């Protein structure tokens, strides 16, 4: 994917909301991050009685 595109020379920048990954930082090092967030969960809205 995007990792394969930077590591092949095809892409030179990923300007995208990339979560900080340790293994990705072992190859492709982030700048200072934008948003200090995490995974959340979509749960359905139940219908009323």
């Amino acid at each position: 994917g995007m990792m394969g595109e930077l590591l092949s020379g095809q892409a030179d920048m990923i300007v995208a909301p990339l979560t900080i990954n340790n293994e990705r930082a072992q190859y492709i090092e982030f700048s200072k991050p934008f948003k200090y967030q995490g995974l959340t969960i979509l749960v359905k809205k139940e219908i009323p009685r």
Binding site: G1, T19, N21, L39, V43
Partner: protein, 46 residues
């Protein structure tokens, strides 16, 4: 009193649920492959 009761009286919260600690087939969940989210899944052991 019953009209007050049966109108005023009596979910998935996260990984700590037994719905995810013991994941069932009535509760199947998914992501998109080749994502960083699946990386965060594949890193942890539990």
């Amino acid at each position: 009193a019953n009209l007050a009761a049966f109108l005023v009286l009596d979910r998935i919260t996260g990984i700590n649920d037994p719905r995810l600690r013991n994941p069932s087939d009535k509760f199947i969940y998914a992501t998109v492959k080749q994502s960083s989210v699946d990386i965060y899944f594949r890193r942890q052991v539990e």
